[PDB]
Structure formats: structure tokens, C-alpha cells
Amino acid sequence: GVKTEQEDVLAKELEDVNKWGLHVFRIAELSGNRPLTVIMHTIFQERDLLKTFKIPVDTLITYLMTLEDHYHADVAYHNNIHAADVVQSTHVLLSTPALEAVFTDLEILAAIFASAIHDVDHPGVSNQFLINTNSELALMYNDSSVLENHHLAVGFKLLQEENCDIFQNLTKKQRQSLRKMVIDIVLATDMSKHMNLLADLKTMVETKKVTSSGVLLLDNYSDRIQVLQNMVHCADLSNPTKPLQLYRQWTDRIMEEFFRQGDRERERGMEISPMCDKHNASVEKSQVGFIDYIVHPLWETWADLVHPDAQDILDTLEDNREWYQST
Ligand SMILES: [Zn+2]
Ligand SMILES: [Zn+2]
């Protein structure tokens, strides 16, 4: 009834689950490529979610393993490790001092569950690739948020497998609310929604209230959900805010995925996508452009929302930006 030594090494690593920069790749190794399962399990226990929602533990484990298995091991970036990272990063963002006591258990469950399923069954190519190849998925979703609609459908559909319904003891009311929030959050991970989300984040920063001091004031669904949406979007785009040794690993993986799509595009004479082209790519330049135009405006705005909880994260982003720039 005692951990093996590998399990103990895993356990000591997981003591960092509440911190930006967990070594998720080491956890992936220690766990036998189960970073999503062990990290979700640790977080659910940590937040008392099993008791609060009467989730039987074997059901939670069975579902997590099933969820994890529907991420593609042969996809370099959009895989279970990325899902685990986004989960644990959303987990840390949820605990930010400026959001203390703001969100309900159900909203907390929604953000974490949405994080876990948000890229499930990703084929490792983009929406545009899927649309252009006349793929079955693109036709099912009428070319609209193709992957993101698919991630949701898979994530929910998997609750129907044997002993997988982790929401079996929630009331209809809890389930309908949970489901809508999860759907709103995941659909918001589509980059084509990025400009609007950021616009609304800013507007809320311009017009933000604080009550009892410190903590933010969110008094309608629109505001509560848009903050959750931006939170997970932030976790999804958190690679450049992480210590450089992690960030570079993510960048290697995303570039491996992009070039591979570039290869497949040429294996069919398709026009080559924005910097998916091996040979004609500057990884350093693309990262700088990515940070200046997308990641920094997002996180800078987030940092303002929860000032100054996010100062260390923003500083790390800027350091990494200068680092890449120095090339
Ligand atoms: Zn995605
Ligand atoms: Zn993602």
C-alpha cells in the first residue's frame, strides 16, 4: 500500500502544481505519459472537487485516462502534454489573489474541465488546412470553428463510455450551467475570436469595480464568462510567459507541428501556410511578432485586470521577448 519510487518522484514534482513553471514535461515522463490524468487528479483533490460534486474516484480516473488517450501521441504540440499544461496554468490563474472568492465551485469546475478537453483529438493541422482539404470535420461544422467544435463534442461524448460519467451526480440545473460555460470557454480558444475577446477584456479593465477591497466585481453572466474565457485563452497562450527552458521546448514542438503541416501542404501543392514553410522560416522573428502582436497585448491587459498579481509573469514574458529579439 505504498508508492513505488518512481511514483514518489512523480509525487514530489507534483508538489509544484500551484506554481507557474511546473515541469510538466518531467511529469509526463514520470507518469508514463499520463500528465493530464495525474495533474487533473491532483487538482481535483486539491480543490476538493470530488466531494463537492460527488464524483466517484474510479469514474474520474477512468474518464481522465479515456480523455488523455484521445489526445494524439504523434502530435508534437497539440497533445495531452499541452492539455495538462493549460489545465495547470488555468489552475494557477484561478488562484490569483485578485480573484479570491470570486468564482463558484461550478465555474471553477467549468474552467478546469474546459481546459482539459479544449484540444482533444487535435489532428495537428489547422482549421484552414481542414477546410481546404474538404475534410469530413470541416463539412460537419460548416467550416466554422471546426477543431474547437470537435474538441467539445469529443470531450462530452467520452462521458458516455463505460464508467466515465464524472457528472453523474450533478442536478440537471448544475449540468446545464456547467455545459454552457464549458462550451463558451472552449469556443473562445479559436484565435479568430482573439481580437474581440481582448477588446472586451480591455473594456472591463477600463470599467472595473472592486469590492470589500482587492477582489474584482463580476455581477452578470456576460462578465463572469468573458473573464473565464480570457483566463483560459491566457493559459492557452502561456508558453512565452514560462521560464525559458519550458518555452523553448514548446516552441520546438509547435514548429515541428507547423513545418509538418507545411510538408503535407506541399505534398499536395497547396499554398504553404503562414510560416509553416520549412526552409523559409525565421523561428525567432515569428516568436517576436507573435509576442508583440498577440501574447503581450493579451497578458498586459490580463495583468491590469488583476494588478499586480501578474507582474512576475509579464516580466518573464518581456525577458523572453528580449531574449528571442537578441537574434
Ligand atoms: Zn485549440
Ligand atoms: Zn490549446
From Swiss-Prot:
Tell me which residues bind Zn(2+) 2: D119
Swiss-Prot/TrEMBL puts the cross-link Glycyl lysine isopeptide (Lys-Gly) (interchain with G-Cter in SUMO) at: K3
Found in which tissues?
Expressed in colonic epithelial cells (at protein level). Widespread; most abundant in skeletal muscle.
**Reported effect, R179D:** Abolishes homodimerization
Q: Where does Mg(2+) bind?
A: D119
Q: Which cysteines are joined by disulfide bonds?
A: none
Query: Ranges for the PDEase domain?
Result: 2-327
Specify the effect of D119N: Decreased 3',5'-cyclic-AMP phosphodiesterase activity. Loss of Mg2(+)-binding
Catalytic residues?
Answer: H78 (proton donor)
Residue positions annotated to bind Mn(2+) are D119
Q: Where does 3',5'-cyclic AMP bind?
A: H78, Q287, F290
> What residues does AMP bind to?
H78, D119, D236, N239, Q287, F290
Q: Where does Zn(2+) 1 bind?
A: H82, H118, D119, D236
Q: How does it assemble?
A: Homodimer for the long isoforms. Isoforms with truncated N-termini are monomeric. Isoform 3 is part of a ternary complex containing PRKAR2A, PRKAR2B and AKAP9. Interacts with PDE4DIP. Identified in a complex composed of RYR1, PDE4D, PKA, FKBP1A and protein phosphatase 1 (PP1). Isoform 5, isoform N3 and isoform 12 bind RACK1 via their unique N-terminus. Binds ARRB2. Interacts (via N-terminal region) with SHANK2 (via proline-rich region); the interaction is increased in a PKA-dependent manner.
Q: What does this protein do?
A: Hydrolyzes the second messenger cAMP, which is a key regulator of many important physiological processes.
Annotated family? Belongs to the cyclic nucleotide phosphodiesterase family. PDE4 subfamily.
Disease annotated for this entry: Genetic variations in PDE4D might be associated with susceptibility to stroke. PubMed:17006457 states that association with stroke has to be considered with caution. Acrodysostosis 2, with or without hormone resistance: A pleiotropic disorder characterized by skeletal, endocrine, and neurological abnormalities. Skeletal features include brachycephaly, midface hypoplasia with a small upturned nose, brachydactyly, and lumbar spinal stenosis. Endocrine abnormalities include hypothyroidism and hypogonadism in males and irregular menses in females. Developmental disability is a common finding but is variable in severity and can be associated with significant behavioral problems.
Q: What's this protein's name?
A: 3',5'-cyclic-AMP phosphodiesterase 4D
Species of origin: Homo sapiens
Q: What is the lineage of its organism?
A: Eukaryota, Metazoa, Chordata, Craniata, Vertebrata
- Gene for this chain: PDE4D
Tell which residues of the whole protein are contained here.
385 to 711 of 809
